[PDB]
Design a protein around this nucleic acid. Sequence first.
DNA 1: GGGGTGTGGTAG
DNA 2: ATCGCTACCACACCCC
Length: 432
Amino acid sequence: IVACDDPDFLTSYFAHSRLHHLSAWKANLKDKFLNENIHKYTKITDKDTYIIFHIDFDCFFATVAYLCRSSSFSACDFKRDPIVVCHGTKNSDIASCNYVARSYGIKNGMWVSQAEKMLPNGIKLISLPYTFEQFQLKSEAFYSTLKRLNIFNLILPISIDEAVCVRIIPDNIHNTNTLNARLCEEIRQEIFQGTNGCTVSIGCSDSLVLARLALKMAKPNGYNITFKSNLSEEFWSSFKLDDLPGVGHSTLSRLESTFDSPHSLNDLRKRYTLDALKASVGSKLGMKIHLALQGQDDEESLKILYDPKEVLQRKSLSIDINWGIRFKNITQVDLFIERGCQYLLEKLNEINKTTSQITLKLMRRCKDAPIEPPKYMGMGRCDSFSRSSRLGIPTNEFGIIATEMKSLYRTLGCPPMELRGLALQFNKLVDV
DNA sequence: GGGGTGTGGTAG
DNA sequence: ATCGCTACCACACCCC
Ligand SMILES: Nc1ccn([C@H]2C[C@H](O)[C@@H](COP(=O)(O)OP(=O)(O)OP(=O)(O)O)O2)c(=O)n1
Ligand SMILES: *[C@@H]1c2c(cc3ccc4cccc5ccc2c3c45)[C@@H](O)[C@H](O)[C@@H]1O
Ligand SMILES: [Mg+2]
Ligand SMILES: [Mg+2]
Ligand SMILES: [Mg+2]
Ligand SMILES: [Mg+2]
């Protein structure tokens, strides 16, 4: 066990943290895109007619972890057994669950202890360990296959297991659903072959928002072609409110409050007005949802097609550690901040930037919260505090940055024993 | 309008 | 045990 005051803590935590991997992978894919396409000026204009193929692996970690499993799990069956990927056996996050598990209401992000409860008697949850190197290898095969096809004007990385692929259609070429369906079947077979048995699903549409919804409809192991002209009651009735991009749990609560708890997006489509939406969830998000219900992309969403090189540029850099934070005194907190700053500065130097503004943010145990929460080493319920500082001159100097971060910690007035998380942020980045 | 800071939501 | 990251938007609120 590597404690938070051990010099190896950050390394160990990031080696084990799947959410660290998700973010680091996305950042590296964006950086790859910027390097690979430096002499490929294949950005979309609003003149162009295009088709979107939104492609992602089915239950990615579970599939890959299953295919690469040890001989101890040789008889375990992906099509018949509920299978999850996680670290532990009780209050440990299910990173990915297969579609058998999902038939019982098990979801990604549920703790194993919750998921076990949802299975009937006679049915055992199979837990597999993370295989991070294999996740990366399968992703490499995925992106290689997409490039090798030589069919997309733009391949935009969304995650380790997910890409938005854009085909521009000339005016003189007539594109048909048959051609679109053949391409879906080609991609699916080629990825299945190239990854040695992982499945992908594909949503195919003439808008980003619809391609994403079509993808959800296609899962698992399928494809769906739904263009704006094909929108129907049956389609919209297949989706929950938080199936919309940008709508998570908090926005869902607001929409259920305002619109008398619509069961599906069809119910919301029947009941809403634009003015009422905007009042429920704000001007920008309201317009996004309204446009989404017509199968249309908001202007913010379209920027990634119109200028991907600008959109994928990194504008800030940070680390977040809100697990395993148990410090006894301020000396240890300071040493940890120093280690974090050292880490961040290596990243800042790799991208040849300086920073002109930094923030320290912390999580402090809520007054009424137990000293140790149900998840081992978890932050539990906390209040956040943050403070920022502008640096006179842009810098990458440890002496300046680490000293200011430590000073920021002191200003926030959190006793070390109550600290449950720290984030160190470089908010503004500057060239050379 | 120009400038600023702190908090919280979402995606993967 | 268990590994609750992190970029970036939107917003509420302050100043001249
Ligand atoms: N709450 C989550 C969500 C996702 N992931 C990781 C594991 C997932 O396998 C991977 C990709 O996420 P997706 O949301 O596409 O989820 P899956 O690929 O697991 O399932 P789906 O078949 O729903 O796409 O990211 C995670 O660790 N925790
Ligand atoms: C940790 C977890 C879970 C649910 C929520 C819900 C709302 C949250 C708001 C802000 C922070 C936060 C941090 C962790 C959370 C949150 C929130 C559960 O899905 C589960 O217990 C997770 O492990
Ligand atoms: Mg997915
Ligand atoms: Mg997936
Ligand atoms: Mg994904
Ligand atoms: Mg959503």
